[PDB]
Amino acid sequence: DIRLVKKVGGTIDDTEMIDGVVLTQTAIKSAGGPTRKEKAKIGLIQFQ
Amino acid sequence: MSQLFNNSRSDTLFLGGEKISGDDIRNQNVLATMAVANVVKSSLGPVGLDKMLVDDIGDFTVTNDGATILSLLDVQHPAGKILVELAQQQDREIGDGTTSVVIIASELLKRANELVKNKIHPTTIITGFRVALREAIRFINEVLSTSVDTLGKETLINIAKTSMSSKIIGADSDFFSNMVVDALLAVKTQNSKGEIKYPVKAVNVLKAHGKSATESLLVPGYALNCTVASQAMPKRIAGGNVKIACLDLNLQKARMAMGVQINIDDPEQLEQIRKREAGIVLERVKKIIDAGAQVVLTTKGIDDLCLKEFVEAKIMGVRRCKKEDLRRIARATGATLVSSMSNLEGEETFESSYLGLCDEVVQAKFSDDECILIKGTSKHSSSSIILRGANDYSLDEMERSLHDSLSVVKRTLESGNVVPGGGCVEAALNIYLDNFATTVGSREQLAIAEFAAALLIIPKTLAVNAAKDSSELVAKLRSYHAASQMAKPEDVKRRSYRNYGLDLIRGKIVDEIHAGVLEPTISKVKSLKSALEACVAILRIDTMITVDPE
Amino acid sequence: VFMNASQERTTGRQAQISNITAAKAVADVIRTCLGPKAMLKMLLDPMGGLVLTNDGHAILREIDVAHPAAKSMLELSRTQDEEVGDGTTTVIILAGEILAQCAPYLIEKNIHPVIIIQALKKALTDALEVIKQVSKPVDVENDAAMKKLIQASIGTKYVIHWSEKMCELALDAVKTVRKDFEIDIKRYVRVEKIPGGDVLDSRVLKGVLLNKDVVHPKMSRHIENPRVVLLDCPLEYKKGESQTNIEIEKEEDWNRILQIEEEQVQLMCEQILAVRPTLVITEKGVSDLAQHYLLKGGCSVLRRVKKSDNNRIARVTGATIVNRVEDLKESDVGTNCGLFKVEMIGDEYFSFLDNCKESGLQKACTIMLRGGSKDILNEIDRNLQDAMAVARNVMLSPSLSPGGGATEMAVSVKLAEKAKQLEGIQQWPYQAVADAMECIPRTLIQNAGGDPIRLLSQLRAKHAQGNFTTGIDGDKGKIVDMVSYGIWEPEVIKQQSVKTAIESACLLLRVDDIVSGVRK
Ligand SMILES: Nc1ncnc2c1ncn2[C@@H]1O[C@H](COP(=O)(O)OP(=O)(O)O)[C@@H](O)[C@H]1O
Ligand SMILES: Nc1ncnc2c1ncn2[C@@H]1O[C@H](COP(=O)(O)OP(=O)(O)O)[C@@H](O)[C@H]1O
Ligand SMILES: [Mg+2]
Ligand SMILES: [Mg+2]
């Protein structure tokens, strides 16, 4: 259940615990989509 | 420093290369550390000199940045890759202190290895470095100086000249100072609900060799490097409110989706189907021309089929360019980048809100290269710098010289507190840690005392490359700093010293405030933290094990 | 071992000595290539050709020099060519002498390079002001003044015998391309060469010279007023982006497929006949079926044309390139074509398009050249590019600098006077710049066969009292003034020689160590 995400760079002191799910994958941004959404409902798409 | 190699024991067998243990590993770690350290020692400081590296194809690279030098060096030693990746981590995050963090971390390994032979345990040595670093950071916060009573941009101008030193632009740093400060202020944006941030690399760097470097023009706007599609198009747009169209859609003869196979039972349908293939593209370009767009930017190549209508309509066509370059054009001019042309309704349409606005769009020819100069943007301002030099190899150095100057000024406006440079902090941290550890003492006093003298490698290396007397300058840096540490904050005098020293040009001790040399506080922090992790990781290694490749 | 490194690492002063010695050998080869008496250098390429020229640009380009510092001198050749095109040999000789003359020290004085660089920046600023004071402006509208200006670069070449004819070709080529500020470019100037013939018979002809004969015997090779229309699309049958894959159920459908291919091409030919063009130029290949319906209406067919030639044809006749035949209109049809003729030469056919010469887009023109062989043509072409580039500097920069080595010697005199007044620690690097400036006029004496000791001694004495136009005579090796010498050179050529040479010297002085063969 515990998920440990690794990111290159930084210092060990910067390690901290997050109160929610951390997404390792990154957005697309090729079409210029908003990277920050406040009070949003996160969905899951198993189709294509 | 390793002789006789090592006797292979038959009772100890492992697949692959032999296993070496004991003091031989730490002796080879320092030997591999001093190998990459001696390369960046001569390149440090305004009196320093860079090195040249041949690529075996006849091309070379001339740069003063320690990150590029170490990046071109592929180290087969396992512990040697840490210092190589340390420079790539230094310029990526802070953007400054690349040569210093390699030299600081090198002296930390040389002194600690001599302490391991003293029989003190490495963890006690590491404990001494971490306790001394915690108090050293607190001393950095005490020497912070907030800019006050300064006239205009002189605060950022004097700080930008520090990064320009030691590089080919150091002699021209007087003229280049106003170009770097005005470049990052034009790209100023807003994010995080009120937080001010700056883009990296947003300022375009164009390479045209000719005239002189002091004549480099600063364009009040973004400049894009591309060649015009058709030579019959006008290279200069007259009149204000020039409309720029940023598009990701190429105009070309295109094949229908691979999942489609055309089967026709009549020969009469061959005329309309072949004509419609080119007619579908006409519907997209026709609505754009009718909107009055003067300049049309396109991410992908455009065939000559659609370039005919651009000549009759006096529209300037554009072909393949970098995707990240077209984003800042639409944001500056007000245009909206369109990945695929569509509307909420099921019918195709084009809105005038997707067109940018600027004062003019002109194409200037620098030497034999032609580039577009976009000046007077509407929505957001932009900037570009065209570097000029004698040869293309000097322009390659001026790019990294300009990129490093943009990172120092970027960290300057994020934190108003700055610290004096030129070996002043390294000399101040020495005495502060000398009186430190005297209260605790015991065994940890020796490991902390060596950490204070380890920071002395930076001010001593600067005096060696100047062909001057180092012992004369180092003895002065210890004279002014030591006596003033005990001062009481009244009766003045006192602490007015210790804030300056180590001027390499005149070889005298002068005030850094009147000189203008300054460094951001962000460059000092995280440099010793990254150098500590590089020192701790190598020091903790007793035995190196190498496995032969399959 | 460790990484990729070591072998023999050159460190200390010997690393800078190797940079000075290697860069000095670059200027020693073309040292005899300076002056009107300059010799020639024959180069042997790995491709099997031959390059014989006195221009330091083409000499240093083909020669393969393997060395970290010496290759930086090779890059300076394209700096003078691409920005200006004249003075490539002077920059290499000057930059080669500056590194030797301005930095013999650190072998002796042990002066830090940056200290010398700080003096080189101040010496470059003062050198520009001296050139501006000795430069007298010249009228750009005087034809007699432009002819003697083009002969400046011609005096050192082989075309000096034809210089009277050469200035006629270079003046008309730059004035035609000039568009009204007055920005011109050599991309529209055609370098096409004709093997054999007499140099006096060569002339600049307006229009584009095509190497292709008419396609059909009934095509008229003589037209009084040709009308040219450019087509990017091929006259053949377009297959399309996707396969047609006709499924033929009945035997009558297959014959209709081949029948439409004749009518579909005919449909594109009927739309061309609406503007009744006399000459049709197609960028791609043409079918033998399309030429018949064009011949019936009077249109002329030609071989496929490269994209580079299509842009020059549109400028001469004012035509607009039309890809879509359906969108072809009378407004895009080229007019005002003087003559269309084809002359027979054993190698290839040649098609001539003459302009009626009578603001708009800049006109295009081709330069015909009749040499004695194929390699002589390539030498004059490099001479025309150097001669026509001189006319581009005077139009953008009306200022006119002194020639014949008077520019470099005038700076050396002013630097020596301010060297004693400056004093300080920078007096040695600042005074050493004047010693490198007098080497260029010294080369003129060594090639002429005179005594550089007695001539340069009287040149410096007569420079202060007499005038700033005093210089070395190339042919007679005597002391003459550029006023009566009648030859001058633009200031842009002298400014690029001082800036490029000094800015490049600062790069080689900063080199500490050299490591070869690190990785790729
Ligand atoms: N003009 C100058 N005068 C005195 N000290 C300087 C000057 N320029 C830089 N320094 C000092 O040299 C150190 C290293 O600078 P530099 O070599 O430009 O960056 P890096 O070490 O990242 O390559 C800095 O800490 C700064 O204090
Ligand atoms: N007839 C001449 N007499 C004396 N000096 C000349 C003569 N012609 C050219 N020079 C000098 O030689 C220099 C280079 O001229 P030129 O040989 O035409 O160009 P390049 O050296 O690039 O071939 C000029 O600066 C000029 O002062
Ligand atoms: Mg720096
Ligand atoms: Mg010449």
On whether both B224 and B271 belong to a single domain, the answer is yes
DSSP codes joined into one string, C127-157: HHHHHHHS-----SS-HHHHHHHHHHHHTTS
Q: Output the CA B383–ligand 4 centroid distance in Å.
A: 38
What ligand 1 atom has the least distance to the C-alpha of B519? 27
Residue C51: phi and psi, rounded to 5, are -130, 115
DSSP code for C215? S
Q: Do B304 and C232 touch, CB atoms closer than 8 A?
A: yes
Rounded to whole angstroms, how far apart are CA atoms B456 and C78?
46
Rounded to whole angstroms, how far apart are CA atoms B71 and B26?
24
Using CA atoms, how far residue B313 sits from B234, B278, B280, B286, B352, in Å, is: 11, 19, 20, 11, 17
Rounded to whole angstroms, how far apart are CA atoms C485 and C467?
14
Rounded to whole angstroms, how far apart are CA atoms B504 and C317?
67
Closest CA to B51 of B40, B59, B35, B67: B40
Residues contacting ligand 1 via CB (< 6 Å): B 44-46, 66, 96-100, 162-163, 165-166, 421-422, 504, 517, 519
Rounded to whole angstroms, how far apart are CA atoms C141 and B121?
87
On whether both C199 and C214 belong to a single domain, the answer is no
Q: Do C99 and C24 touch, CB atoms closer than 8 A?
A: yes
Buried b (16+ CB within 10 A) or exposed e, C302-340: bbebeeebbbbbbbbbbbbbbbbbeebeeebbbeebbbb
> Is B467 within 8 Å of chain C by CB?
yes
Rounded to whole angstroms, how far apart are CA atoms C488 and C482?
7
Sheet strands (E) in B167-222: 189-191, 195-197, 204-207, 218-219
Boundary (domain end) residue, out of C362, C390, C420: C362
Rounded to whole angstroms, how far apart are CA atoms C336 and C228?
10
Block residue for tokens 């500590």: B532
Q: Which chains touch B (3 or more CB pairs under 8 A)?
A: A, C
The answer for B 42-81 residues in CB contact with C (under 8 A) is: 42-43, 46-58, 60, 62, 64, 72-77, 80
Domain total of chain C = 3
Q: Is C155 in the pocket of ligand 2 (CB under 6 A)?
A: yes
Q: Which run of H or of E encompasses A42?
A: none
On whether both C277 and C190 belong to a single domain, the answer is no
On whether both C12 and C68 belong to a single domain, the answer is yes
Residue B506 sits in a domain whose CATH number is 1.10.560.10
- Between strands C204-206 and C400-401, the pairing is unpaired
Q: At a CB cut-off of 8 Å and minimum separation 6, what does C8 contact?
A: none
Closest CA to C397 of C499, C490, C494, C482: C490
On whether both B132 and B154 belong to a single domain, the answer is no
DSSP codes joined into one string, C442-472: HHHHHHHT--HHHHHHHHHHHHHHT-TTEEE
On whether both C228 and C101 belong to a single domain, the answer is no
On whether both C223 and C305 belong to a single domain, the answer is yes
> Is C232 within 8 Å of chain B by CB?
yes
Boundary (domain end) residue, out of C362, C382, C416: C362
Q: Biggest alpha carbon distance in chain C?
A: 103
The helix/strand count (H/E) of chain A reads as 0, 0
On whether both C134 and C166 belong to a single domain, the answer is no
Angle, alpha carbons A4-A10-A11 (nearest 5°): 85
Q: Does B529 contact A11 at a Cβ distance shorter than 8 Å?
A: yes
On whether both C247 and C351 belong to a single domain, the answer is yes
On whether both B323 and B355 belong to a single domain, the answer is yes
**Structural domain harbouring C143:** 139-206+363-398
Closest CA to B303 of A14, C452, C358, C323: C323
Angle, alpha carbons B60-B64-B67 (nearest 5°): 90
- Between strands B60-63 and B145-146, the pairing is unpaired
On whether both C391 and C412 belong to a single domain, the answer is no
The helix/strand count (H/E) of chain C reads as 17, 14
Give the one of B323, B327, B530 whose C-beta lies nearest to A11's C-beta. B530
Side-chain half-sphere of B105: how many Cα atoms within 13 Å? 36
Rounded to whole angstroms, how far apart are CA atoms B389 and B366?
12
On whether both C7 and C102 belong to a single domain, the answer is yes
Using CA atoms, how far residue C29 sits from B419, B474, C40, C254, C497, in Å, is: 53, 49, 11, 73, 18
Q: Output the CA B462–ligand 1 centroid distance in Å.
A: 9
| Residues followed by a gap in chain C, C→N > 2.5 Å | 180, 358
| Contact residues of B toward A, CB < 8 A | 89, 92-93, 323, 327, 336-337, 339-340, 526, 529-530, 533
Closest CA of chain A from B134, distance in Å: 12
Q: Tell me if there are at least 3 CB pairs under 8 Å linking chains C and A.
A: no
Sheet holding B60-63, edge to edge: B60-63, B50-54, C511-515
Give me the active site residues of C, please.
Answer: 55, 88-89, 386
Using CA atoms, how far residue B137 sits from B129, B254, B266, B525, in Å, is: 12, 62, 84, 7
Closest CA to B425 of B520, B531, B494, B536: B520
Buried b (16+ CB within 10 A) or exposed e, C378-387: bbbbbbbbbb
Rounded to whole angstroms, how far apart are CA atoms C506 and C410?
23
**Structural domain harbouring B206:** 148-219+381-416
On whether both C352 and C247 belong to a single domain, the answer is yes
Residue C282: phi and psi, rounded to 5, are -115, 135
**Residue C104: Cβ within 10 Å count:** 14
On whether both B129 and B246 belong to a single domain, the answer is no
Q: Which run of H or of E encompasses C480?
A: strand C479-481
Q: Do B50 and B62 touch, CB atoms closer than 8 A?
A: yes
- Which two structure tokens, joined as six digits, stand for C341? 């003729």
> Bridge partners of B545?
B19
DSSP code for C362? P
* One-letter amino acid for residue C156 of the chain: T
Residue C217: phi and psi, rounded to 5, are -60, -30
Q: Do B329 and B215 touch, CB atoms closer than 8 A?
A: no
DSSP codes joined into one string, C294-343: HHHHT--------HHHHHHHHHHS----B--STT--GGGS---EEEEEEE
- Between strands B295-298 and B244-247, the pairing is parallel
On whether both C478 and C367 belong to a single domain, the answer is no
Domain total of chain B = 3
- Which two structure tokens, joined as six digits, stand for C29? 């080869």
Angle, alpha carbons B435-B438-B440 (nearest 5°): 135
On whether both B407 and B483 belong to a single domain, the answer is no
Block residue for tokens 């310029």: B91
Rounded to whole angstroms, how far apart are CA atoms B499 and B422?
10
- Between strands B544-545 and B50-54, the pairing is unpaired
> Is C492 within 8 Å of chain B by CB?
no
DSSP code for B255? P
> Bridge partners of B338?
B247
By what method was this entry solved? cryo-EM
Q: Output the CA C86–ligand 4 centroid distance in Å.
A: 5
Rounded to whole angstroms, how far apart are CA atoms C244 and C260?
14
Residue B386 sits in a domain whose CATH number is 3.30.260.10
Q: Is C36 in the pocket of ligand 2 (CB under 6 A)?
A: yes
Rounded to whole angstroms, how far apart are CA atoms B318 and B372?
10
**Residue B367: Cβ within 10 Å count:** 17
Rg, Å, chain A Cα set: 14
- Which two structure tokens, joined as six digits, stand for B207? 């390479």
Rounded to whole angstroms, how far apart are CA atoms C473 and C155?
12
Q: Do B394 and B277 touch, CB atoms closer than 8 A?
A: no
The helix/strand count (H/E) of chain B reads as 18, 18
The resolution in Å comes to: 3.0
On whether both C301 and C239 belong to a single domain, the answer is yes
Rounded to whole angstroms, how far apart are CA atoms B411 and B419?
12
Buried b (16+ CB within 10 A) or exposed e, B518-531: bbbbbbbbbbbbbb
On whether both B104 and B178 belong to a single domain, the answer is no
On whether both B228 and B373 belong to a single domain, the answer is yes
Residue C498 sits in a domain whose CATH number is 1.10.560.10
On whether both B388 and B338 belong to a single domain, the answer is no
* One-letter amino acid for residue B99 of the chain: T
**Residue B422: Cβ within 10 Å count:** 25
Q: Biggest alpha carbon distance in chain B?
A: 105
